[PDB]
């Protein structure tokens, strides 16, 4: 049935969602899981939100990603206004009008990471690796833990995702192409890809690999 988590809300706001939840017998939880069906986002008048992990895992799961205005309107009209009319068009990074969650809900038989082996390599921040990993799996990638664990052959397409920030290194990420044969890119390829729910050409995200 219905199970929600919220993102970007204040307690009073959260208490309103609780109110909503109790009235409609909807489950409400702290952590987003398989079962989670809705992700309630803080947005602006025009349904743009910030990009939070829950935002991403929401889209990655093709769950309902709906503006907080869904809640308050329902309350304000003693009834559940269908999710359809409160979705988030976009975010403060990937554009105010990309229909991300929309697309996602509309393509679980063809996921942006069809035929991809991804290795999240090195350290990340604000987002634990396993969550980024979970993300890409929800999009149909296959997680690989070690650079050397890539499935050789051709059937598949390998990719190394890094986040330069969390590195404070010398010969670290400029030199990944030395220990494997895959394109290397920043986390932004994934997040951007998931936001728009369109598989983004590596072009813009590749990191300089030494020979």
């Amino acid at each position: 049935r219905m199970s929600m988590v919220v993102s970007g809300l204040t307690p009073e706001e959260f208490m309103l969602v609780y109110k909503f939840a109790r009235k409609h017998h909807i489950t409400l939880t702290n952590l987003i899981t398989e079962e989670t069906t809705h992700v309630v986002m803080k947005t602006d008048a025009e349904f743009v939100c910030e990009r939070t992990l829950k935002y991403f895992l929401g889209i990655a799961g093709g769950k309902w990603v709906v503006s907080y205005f869904w809640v308050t309107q329902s309350i304000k009209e003693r009834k559940m206004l269908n999710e359809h009319d409160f979705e988030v068009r976009g975010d403060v990074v990937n554009g105010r009008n990309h229909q991300g969650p929309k697309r996602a809900r509309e393509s679980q038989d063809r996921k942006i990471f069809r035929g991809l082996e991804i290795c999240c390599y090195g350290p990340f921040t604000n987002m634990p690796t396993d969550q980024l990993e979970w993300m890409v799996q929800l999009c149909g990638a296959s997680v690989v833990k070690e650079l050397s664990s890539f499935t050789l052959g051709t059937g598949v397409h390998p990719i190394v995702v890094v986040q330069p920030d969390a590195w404070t290194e010398d010969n670290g990420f400029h030199a990944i192409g030395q220990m494997c044969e895959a394109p290397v890119v920043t986390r932004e390829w994934v997040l951007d890809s998931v936001a728009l729910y369109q598989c983004q050409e590596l072009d813009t995200y590749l990191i300089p690999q030494i020979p």
Binding site: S7, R51, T52, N126, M127, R187
Partner: peptide, 4 residues
């Protein structure tokens, strides 16, 4: 929550 953190933003990205």
């Amino acid at each position: 929550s953190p933003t990205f």
